[PDB]
Amino acid sequence: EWTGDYENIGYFSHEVISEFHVGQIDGGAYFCIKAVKADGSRSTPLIACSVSNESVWAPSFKVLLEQARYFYVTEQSVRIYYDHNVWTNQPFVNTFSTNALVGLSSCSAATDCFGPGKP
Amino acid sequence: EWTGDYENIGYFSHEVISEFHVGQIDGGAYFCIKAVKADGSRSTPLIACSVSNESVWAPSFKVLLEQARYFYVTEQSVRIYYDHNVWTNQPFVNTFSTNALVGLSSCSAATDCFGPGKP
Amino acid sequence: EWTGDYENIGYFSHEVISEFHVGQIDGGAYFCIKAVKADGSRSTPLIACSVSNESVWAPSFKVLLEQARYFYVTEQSVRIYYDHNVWTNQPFVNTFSTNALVGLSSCSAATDCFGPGKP
Amino acid sequence: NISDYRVMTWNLQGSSASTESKWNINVRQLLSGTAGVDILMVQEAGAIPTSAVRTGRHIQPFGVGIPIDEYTWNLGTTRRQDIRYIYYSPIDVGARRVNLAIVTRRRADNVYVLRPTTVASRPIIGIGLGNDVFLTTHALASGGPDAAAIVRVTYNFFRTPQMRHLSWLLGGDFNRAPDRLESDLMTEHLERLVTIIAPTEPTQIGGNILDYGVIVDRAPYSQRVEALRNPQLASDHYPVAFEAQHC
Amino acid sequence: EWTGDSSINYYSDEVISDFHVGQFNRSAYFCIKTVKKSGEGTPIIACALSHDSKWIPSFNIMLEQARNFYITGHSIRVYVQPNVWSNKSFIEALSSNALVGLSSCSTSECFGPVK
Amino acid sequence: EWTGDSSINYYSDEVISDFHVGQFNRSAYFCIKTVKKSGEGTPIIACALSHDSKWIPSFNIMLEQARNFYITGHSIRVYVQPNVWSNKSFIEALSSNALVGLSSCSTSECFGPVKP
Amino acid sequence: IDFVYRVDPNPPDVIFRDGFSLLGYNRDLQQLISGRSCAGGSSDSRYIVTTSDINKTYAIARAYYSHSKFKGNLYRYKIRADNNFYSLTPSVNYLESQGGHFNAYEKSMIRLQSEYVSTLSILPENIQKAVALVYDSSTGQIKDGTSTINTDYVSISSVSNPGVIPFLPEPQANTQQRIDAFGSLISSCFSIYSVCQTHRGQKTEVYKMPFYDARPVIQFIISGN
C-alpha cells in the first residue's frame, strides 16, 4: 500500500478544501473534507473522509488531519489523493462519500502538484 | 454510534462558539463550549460538553477538543452536533448541560453545512 | 546516528519549503518536502521525505513534521539536513527522492545558519 | 506626497469680535480627533489663540528676512502631548485683519516667504515639510486681481533647478471664482501646468465659490488630492479641505 | 473531584501575563501568573504537574488551553485548589495552587461552575 | 532535581533567535540559540534530547514552549544545566547545556524561580 | 534597515515617475498589523509597508504567480530607507506602555513580515533599482530578470528611523479581530492593492488577492501540529 499507487488511488488536482467536518463513527474518530476546483470551474464537490479506527489508511489519520485543517483555513490549492469504495456504512456513505483521504499535496505551481502522478 | 444517527445526535446550524471551558471531572479531562447564533437570532445559547474518559464518545475527544479550539479563534460559523442526556452528574448538569459534543462541522454562505443533515 | 554527521548527512542551507506532501506508505505515515533555493538559483528541487514507521530516522518523524509544517506556511530560510539512499521502494524513489529528512535548521539570513556544519 | 496630509483652509470671516472664541473652539474641534486636520491653512487670522507659548527657536530666515515665530500651542493636557506649531508673521500686530498664519501637526523643516513681482504687496507665508510645501496666501476682496500673479510667482520661484523636485499646493482666499482664473491661465498658455481644485458647491453665504486650491501638476499623485467642502457644522460658515480620492 | 466542587476557588476577569515551563521531578510542570485586566490586584499563580496530583489526566488539556488563553489576551476565570504541592522550595518560588480549570469571561458572566 | 535548583543556571531578558530539530541516536533533539533582546554577550545554545538525560519527561512540553516563544519573539528566561551531553561532537556542534525551563519574561521583573 | 523592498506589478517606467503613494489617512497601528485597513477591509491606511528581507519579496511573488488568475509582470523595487521609515516593534512597545494589548497572533507576524512602514508616500528618488521577477511556469520557479536602475534616484546616506511613529492613535480594547494575510503568512498590507494603484488617473486592473485569517494558521504552528 502507498498513496501514489495510481491504478488504485485516484486524485483531484488544484482543489481547495472549502468545508471541514469532524465526528465519530463506530467508536473511531473521523474527519471529512469537501473540495471544489480552485480554477473556478464546475465539478461535483469531492468529499474525502478518514476514519481513525477503520480501513488500512488509519496510521496516517492524524497526519492527514493537521494538514487538511491547514489547507482549509489557508484555502491553498491542494491535490487530494483518495481511494474509492473504502467506507461501507450506508448512512455514512450517503452524507459523505466512499472516498478515503490517503494523501494531501500542495499544488502551488498552477501547472502540476508535488507528489505521485499518473504518467 | 455516529454523529448523524439523527435518531439521537441533534444539530444546531449556523452557530458560533462564544465561550470555552476546560477542567477535570472524575479522573477525566473535559471541555465545554457555548454556541450563540452568529445572526443574534437569540435561542438559548447551546452548551455542549465532552469528557475524555466518560461516555461512549471518548475516542473523539482530542479530535473534537482541537476542533472546538480552532472554530473558536476563527469565530467562523459552525454546525454543532450534540447527544442530549449524556451526562448524569447533577452538579455537572446544573452548570453546563446534559449535552455531549459529538460533531463540529464548518458552515458557509448562510446556506448548507458540510455534514450529516436531516431532510 | 546523528543529523550532523557531515559524513553521511548532507545539508543545503538557505532553502525554502515550497511544496508539502503527506500520505501513507506500507502501514506508516510519510511526509515529503520540496526545497528550492530562495533566490531561484539552483533550479532543481531537494525532495526529502520522512516515513514514520521505517528507517533509523523514524524516532524523529513527528518532531521533524511540526517544524517542517512551520517552515512551509511561513517559508523562512531553512537549512535542510538529508540522508541519501534511505528509501528502497522504487516508485517512491522515482516520484520522490531517496533522500530522508533528517534535520531542520533555522537560517538567520546572512551567510550563517545555526546547526552542525562542515569546517 | 502632497496628498499624505489632511489640509483645510478655514477662513475666519470675522463675526463682530469673536476672534479668540472662534479660534479656540473651531480650530480645536477641527484639529482634534482621528480625522483631525494635519496642516490647517488659517488666513486673515490676526490675533492669537491666547494659549500659544512663547520662546520659539531662532529663525534665519531663508530668502526673506521677516522673522516667523513657531508658537507651540499644546491642545492636550499635561499628560497628553498634542502640541501644534503655528508659524505666524507679525506683519501688523496693530491691525490683526490680514495677518496670515499656518498651524501644523509637526515642526516644519523649512519655511518660506515670497511676494509677487510688484513691490507694494505683502507675502503669502508658506511652510514646508520635507519635500511637500504648503503655501498660505491672502488676496484682495475687490475681485482678487493678484491671484494669477501669485500663482505665477510661486511657479517661477519653485521652478529653480534645486527646488524642482519640491511639490507645492496653494490654498487660501483668492477672492475670484476658479473659472475666471483658469480662463485667464488658458489665455496665458498656462493650462496643463497647474491644477485648480474647488468644491462644486458655493463656499460662502453670499454664493461665492472662492476659497479653493491650486496645485503643481508635476507633483506625483496631484490628481489624487481634491478639494471638497466639510460637512455642515452650521457655525454660520465653513472651510474647505483637500482630501485624497479613494482608490 | 471536579473543577467546581467547593474546595476549588476561582478568580474571574484575569488575563495570563506570565508563563513558565519546567520539570519538577520525573514530571513536566507549567505555571501561569494571571493578573486582573482592570488592575489593582494581587497576581494569582497556578501550577500543574504531569505525574503528580489528582489532576494528572487534565495536565495536557490545561497546558494547551493556558497557552491558548496566553496567546490571546482574552479575560479568563482561573480555577485553583490551594495546598496541592508540598515541596516548600516550589511553593516559595512559584505557588502552592493547582491549575484545575480555565474558562472564558465575556463581560459580566464567565463560563463555568460558578458558586 | 528541579528547574529552580542551584546547579541550574538561568538567563533573563532573552529571545530565541535560532531553532534547530534533528535526531541523535534514537532520539529527537531540539536546539535553540537565544541572544539578549536589545543585544549583548555571547549567544547561548540549549538542547534537549528525547530519550537521553534525566530531562526526558519534559521534552515535548519544552519543545512546544520553545517553538511558541520562538514564533512570537517573546523576551524570555532560559534555564540551562551545563555539562549534560557527553559526545563532544554535539559539544563542538551546538552546545553542552540542556534546556530545563522556559519562562515568559517582562520589562524589569519576570516570572520563574530565581536564585537568592 | 536601509534598502527595503516592495513588490509591485507596475513597470519601472511608472514607479520611477509616480512612485508608491499612501492609500488613505488611517494612522492606527492596530489595523495595519492585522490588515483591516490595508486591502481586506476599509482600506485607508496612512502607511506603505515594505519588507526589509529579500526573501519576503520572493514569497510575495510566489503568492501572486501561483493562482492562475494573475496576469502581469512583478517587479521588486529597492527603496532607500530615509528618516520616514519606522520598524513596527518600537511603536508596538510604546503602544503597550500606553495601555494597549498586542496579542501573540500579531507579535508573531511583526517578526515574520519584517515590516518597515513608511508614513509618507515613497518618493521616486528613494527607489534605486527595479528587478523584474520572471515566473518559469514549467519549472514553477521565480527568478530575477532585468535589473533596471533608476536615473532619478538620489543617493543620499540615510537609515530607517529608530523610534516610535509620530501621532500614533490611542489604542483600543482587545478586540481579537481578523488578521488578514495571504500566501505564506504574508501580511495583507504587502498586497498589490494596499497602495494607491491609480497612477495618473489610470487604474491598474490586476487580480484582487483573496485573504485568509491568519489566527488559525499561527495557532497551527505556535501549538505544534
Side-chain angles (χ1 to χ4, degrees):
Chain A
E1 78 203 336
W2 174 43
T3 290
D5 263 359
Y6 30 84
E7 49 90 345
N8 167 6
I9 281 70
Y11 59 86
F12 274 84
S13 175
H14 299 89
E15 302 268 65
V16 294
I17 303 172
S18 88
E19 322 271 29
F20 214 91
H21 168 82
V22 172
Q24 152 163 342
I25 179 189
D26 262 39
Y30 85 84
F31 81 93
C32 297
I33 60 153
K34 164 181 290 185
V36 301
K37 274 286 136 143
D39 299 16
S41 34
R42 182 94 253 156
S43 301
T44 66
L46 178 72
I47 296 188
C49 299
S50 89
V51 186
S52 116
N53 259 337
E54 292 164 26
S55 100
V56 315
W57 317 96
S60 53
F61 166 79
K62 300 182 174 302
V63 160
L64 292 157
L65 215 177
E66 303 159 345
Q67 205 74 41
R69 204 137 53 195
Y70 161 69
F71 288 146
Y72 167 48
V73 297
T74 292
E75 299 125 41
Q76 158 132 22
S77 302
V78 51
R79 183 183 283 181
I80 297 181
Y81 296 89
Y82 68 73
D83 194 333
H84 206 48
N85 308 304
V86 174
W87 312 124
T88 62
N89 288 69
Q90 281 299 322
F92 191 93
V93 151
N94 282 139
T95 179
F96 300 122
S97 268
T98 73
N99 299 317
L101 213 39
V102 308
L104 280 159
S105 129
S106 68
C107 215
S108 176
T111 301
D112 258 346
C113 336
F114 175 60
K118 56 183 178 173
Chain B
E1 63 216 42
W2 178 42
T3 166
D5 269 334
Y6 118 71
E7 278 158 336
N8 334 254
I9 292 64
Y11 51 95
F12 262 79
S13 293
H14 287 279
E15 289 301 313
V16 77
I17 290 167
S18 192
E19 322 280 56
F20 210 96
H21 171 79
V22 294
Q24 163 165 350
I25 203 189
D26 310 327
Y30 81 92
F31 84 94
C32 216
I33 57 135
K34 198 190 194 69
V36 205
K37 234 77 162 182
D39 53 65
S41 161
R42 56 209 59 82
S43 279
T44 49
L46 175 66
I47 285 171
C49 268
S50 173
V51 183
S52 154
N53 276 4
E54 253 206 2
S55 208
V56 26
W57 316 105
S60 70
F61 171 81
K62 337 182 154 53
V63 195
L64 268 293
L65 162 84
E66 298 184 19
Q67 201 77 52
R69 189 190 289 154
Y70 263 90
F71 282 149
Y72 176 66
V73 307
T74 323
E75 333 205 319
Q76 153 163 207
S77 283
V78 148
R79 168 180 287 175
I80 288 155
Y81 295 81
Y82 47 80
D83 185 3
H84 192 57
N85 319 320
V86 151
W87 314 123
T88 52
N89 198 27
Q90 184 44 243
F92 195 67
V93 178
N94 207 248
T95 177
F96 288 137
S97 35
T98 30
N99 292 335
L101 185 50
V102 279
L104 269 166
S105 320
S106 172
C107 225
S108 157
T111 179
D112 85 54
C113 222
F114 191 37
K118 288 262 76 154
Chain C
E1 209 63 28
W2 182 38
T3 293
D5 251 338
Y6 83 78
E7 290 192 357
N8 196 351
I9 310 308
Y11 74 72
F12 270 107
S13 299
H14 303 91
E15 310 274 276
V16 296
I17 296 175
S18 64
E19 313 272 272
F20 213 85
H21 171 82
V22 294
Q24 177 199 8
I25 178 181
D26 299 355
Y30 78 102
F31 88 87
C32 303
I33 69 177
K34 211 194 80 162
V36 285
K37 213 79 192 180
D39 44 28
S41 295
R42 189 174 345 105
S43 94
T44 193
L46 185 56
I47 303 133
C49 299
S50 185
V51 183
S52 151
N53 72 333
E54 95 158 12
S55 100
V56 301
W57 304 116
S60 59
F61 160 75
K62 191 192 183 199
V63 192
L64 276 172
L65 184 52
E66 304 167 359
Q67 268 264 311
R69 262 172 199 164
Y70 159 78
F71 283 117
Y72 166 63
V73 316
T74 78
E75 287 190 13
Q76 303 261 288
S77 281
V78 56
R79 168 183 278 180
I80 290 132
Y81 297 83
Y82 61 78
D83 195 17
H84 210 313
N85 286 114
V86 176
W87 311 125
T88 69
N89 206 343
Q90 262 303 321
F92 193 105
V93 184
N94 267 80
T95 178
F96 299 117
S97 266
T98 39
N99 293 289
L101 190 54
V102 165
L104 280 171
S105 279
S106 177
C107 262
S108 207
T111 299
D112 265 348
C113 214
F114 177 73
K118 321 161 180 160
Chain D
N1 300 191
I2 207 66
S3 173
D4 312 323
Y5 307 96
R6 192 130 46 168
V7 201
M8 164 175 313
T9 38
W10 186 216
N11 86 310
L12 285 321
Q13 201 252 349
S15 284
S16 46
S18 51
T19 166
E20 42 193 343
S21 186
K22 81 202 309 181
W23 248 106
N24 224 288
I25 297 271
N26 308 48
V27 327
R28 93 175 322 112
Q29 214 175 255
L30 252 58
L31 293 213
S32 47
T34 60
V37 160
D38 295 60
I39 319 303
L40 185 299
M41 279 224 162
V42 47
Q43 64 280 44
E44 82 108 23
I48 272 300
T50 71
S51 7
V53 317
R54 272 296 317 117
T55 74
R57 94 270 185 215
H58 86 67
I59 191 192
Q60 287 285 266
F62 299 89
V64 162
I66 326 167
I68 295 320
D69 49 67
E70 54 116 356
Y71 298 142
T72 353
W73 182 29
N74 185 3
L75 262 43
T77 89
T78 299
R79 154 252 203 276
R80 256 313 298 141
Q81 271 323 299
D82 261 40
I83 77 87
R84 299 297 144 118
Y85 286 100
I86 321 104
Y87 314 76
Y88 165 94
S89 38
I91 300 318
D92 44 318
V93 225
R96 309 153 162 278
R97 158 202 163 70
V98 86
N99 205 174
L100 295 173
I102 273 172
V103 35
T104 164
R105 192 167 228 154
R106 73 178 193 93
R107 212 185 204 104
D109 319 333
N110 279 11
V111 86
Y112 305 86
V113 206
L114 47 58
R115 74 184 73 230
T117 200
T118 315
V119 170
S121 310
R122 62 207 97 213
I124 272 23
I125 317 160
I127 86 187
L129 326 164
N131 276 244
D132 304 335
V133 158
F134 299 83
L135 292 159
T136 207
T137 89
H138 200 330
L140 267 308
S142 265
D146 64 329
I150 186 182
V151 198
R152 188 42 253 191
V153 48
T154 47
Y155 177 37
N156 67 71
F157 197 96
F158 283 97
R159 214 193 29 210
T160 319
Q162 75 276 10
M163 254 160 219
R164 207 217 200 161
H165 53 296
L166 263 53
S167 101
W168 62 269
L169 167 149
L170 196 94
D173 85 82
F174 290 113
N175 288 316
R176 167 192 298 216
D179 301 320
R180 297 129 208 70
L181 216 166
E182 48 168 308
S183 100
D184 76 308
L185 274 172
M186 292 155 43
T187 281
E188 198 41 283
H189 263 248
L190 285 136
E191 310 112 304
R192 45 207 81 74
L193 201 134
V194 287
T195 320
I196 304 99
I197 58 200
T200 80
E201 291 81 21
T203 166
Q204 208 139 322
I205 325 303
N208 270 315
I209 190 60
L210 319 181
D211 191 23
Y212 46 90
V214 294
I215 176 152
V216 64
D217 282 21
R218 44 144 290 287
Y221 297 87
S222 58
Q223 60 276 353
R224 232 173 91 81
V225 15
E226 44 91 9
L228 77 100
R229 256 210 290 141
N230 80 327
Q232 318 292 137
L233 253 63
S235 153
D236 265 344
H237 218 293
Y238 40 100
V240 311
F242 315 138
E243 318 290 16
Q245 267 195 313
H246 223 230
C247 324
Chain E
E1 72 275 336
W2 180 42
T3 313
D5 262 336
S6 58
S7 161
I8 299 80
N9 48 70
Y10 51 92
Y11 299 85
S12 297
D13 296 272
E14 310 261 0
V15 297
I16 296 181
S17 81
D18 286 348
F19 208 93
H20 171 70
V21 167
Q23 198 224 40
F24 180 55
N25 254 324
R26 90 168 217 110
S27 91
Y29 79 90
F30 82 93
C31 300
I32 61 167
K33 203 170 64 37
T34 67
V35 311
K36 225 79 156 186
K37 182 162 60 79
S38 81
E40 171 52 33
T42 67
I44 138 203
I45 313 197
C47 294
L49 267 81
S50 357
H51 294 121
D52 203 18
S53 87
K54 93 188 66 165
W55 314 109
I56 283 172
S58 70
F59 170 73
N60 291 312
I61 187 180
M62 227 90 58
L63 172 58
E64 295 164 0
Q65 200 74 37
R67 290 199 187 108
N68 196 299
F69 282 153
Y70 169 64
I71 289 157
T72 94
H74 201 355
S75 321
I76 79 187
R77 180 197 273 185
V78 177
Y79 292 82
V80 294
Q81 170 180 340
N83 305 312
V84 159
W85 316 127
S86 61
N87 186 310
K88 274 110 73 183
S89 198
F90 193 70
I91 296 68
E92 190 283 272
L94 296 160
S95 147
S96 46
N97 293 336
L99 195 43
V100 291
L102 296 161
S103 305
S104 283
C105 245
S106 76
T107 165
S108 293
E109 191 46 28
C110 217
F111 186 48
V114 64
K115 85 174 145 103
Chain F
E1 54 172 24
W2 179 41
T3 301
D5 282 346
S6 180
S7 34
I8 290 59
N9 196 14
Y10 57 84
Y11 306 73
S12 292
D13 300 296
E14 292 219 324
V15 86
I16 296 181
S17 100
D18 283 32
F19 217 87
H20 168 113
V21 272
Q23 178 176 352
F24 176 84
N25 310 354
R26 276 83 215 96
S27 273
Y29 79 96
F30 93 85
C31 246
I32 70 171
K33 182 154 74 69
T34 89
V35 66
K36 294 289 302 194
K37 198 185 182 299
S38 321
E40 204 166 344
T42 39
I44 171 59
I45 305 181
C47 243
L49 277 275
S50 153
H51 296 130
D52 185 332
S53 208
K54 63 179 76 173
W55 318 101
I56 275 174
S58 77
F59 164 72
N60 285 339
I61 180 161
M62 224 87 48
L63 179 54
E64 304 164 2
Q65 199 70 36
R67 199 183 296 111
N68 182 289
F69 282 156
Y70 172 63
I71 299 178
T72 308
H74 218 290
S75 101
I76 70 183
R77 154 182 284 171
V78 156
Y79 294 84
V80 284
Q81 185 190 354
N83 332 296
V84 162
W85 312 120
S86 44
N87 172 231
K88 194 57 62 55
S89 40
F90 213 86
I91 313 324
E92 330 322 335
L94 305 154
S95 147
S96 55
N97 303 330
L99 204 53
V100 278
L102 287 153
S103 71
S104 189
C105 265
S106 305
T107 64
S108 180
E109 96 300 0
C110 62
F111 196 39
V114 71
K115 264 172 319 213
Chain G
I1 301 323
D2 42 85
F3 294 136
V4 312
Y5 298 102
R6 174 140 198 92
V7 175
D8 194 322
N10 307 305
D13 314 295
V14 164
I15 320 285
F16 288 160
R17 169 226 311 142
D18 296 295
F20 307 94
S21 175
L22 259 45
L23 197 71
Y25 287 115
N26 193 352
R27 209 141 32 179
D28 205 358
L29 209 80
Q30 195 120 9
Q31 311 197 33
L32 177 98
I33 305 189
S34 99
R36 304 303 320 164
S37 94
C38 271
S42 59
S43 98
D44 53 355
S45 59
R46 200 202 275 250
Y47 296 113
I48 289 180
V49 198
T50 37
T51 176
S52 153
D53 228 331
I54 192 83
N55 285 180
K56 209 74 199 162
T57 281
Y58 299 117
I60 303 173
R62 202 159 40 245
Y64 271 110
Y65 269 144
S66 87
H67 262 210
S68 150
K69 302 230 235 183
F70 170 78
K71 333 264 163 218
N73 331 296
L74 297 180
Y75 294 82
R76 147 166 52 93
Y77 295 86
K78 174 148 69 168
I79 320 185
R80 180 196 82 248
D82 57 56
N83 205 76
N84 281 329
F85 291 69
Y86 303 78
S87 185
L88 270 206
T89 89
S91 320
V92 153
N93 290 335
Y94 166 110
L95 288 212
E96 292 215 86
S97 79
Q98 288 333 72
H101 186 35
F102 289 99
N103 41 23
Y105 290 143
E106 279 158 335
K107 277 152 159 335
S108 94
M109 275 223 200
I110 303 163
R111 171 201 178 262
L112 261 53
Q113 311 298 338
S114 169
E115 329 195 12
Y116 271 75
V117 298
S118 173
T119 59
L120 296 154
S121 324
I122 295 165
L123 276 167
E125 78 195 51
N126 291 56
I127 322 174
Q128 147 154 125
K129 202 189 293 263
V131 174
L133 308 190
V134 278
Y135 168 42
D136 188 10
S137 174
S138 69
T139 318
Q141 288 264 25
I142 290 75
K143 28 169 304 297
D144 309 9
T146 36
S147 56
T148 135
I149 164 173
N150 189 9
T151 65
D152 184 345
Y153 164 68
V154 181
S155 177
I156 89 168
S157 147
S158 44
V159 304
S160 123
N161 185 7
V164 201
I165 284 141
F167 324 129
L168 221 40
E170 232 65 71
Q172 270 265 58
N174 93 235
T175 332
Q176 282 165 42
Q177 210 31 41
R178 194 181 167 93
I179 313 197
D180 275 350
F182 79 89
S184 64
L185 280 185
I186 321 167
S187 197
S188 85
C189 299
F190 281 112
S191 160
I192 286 179
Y193 287 110
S194 287
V195 307
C196 176
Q197 293 291 356
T198 306
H199 305 254
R200 197 63 39 70
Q202 296 111 20
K203 307 191 170 194
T204 284
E205 277 122 11
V206 298
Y207 189 41
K208 300 275 197 144
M209 177 102 258
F211 298 121
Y212 64 79
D213 197 49
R215 290 175 310 176
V217 199
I218 305 169
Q219 188 75 89
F220 163 83
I221 57 177
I222 218 177
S223 160
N225 288 345

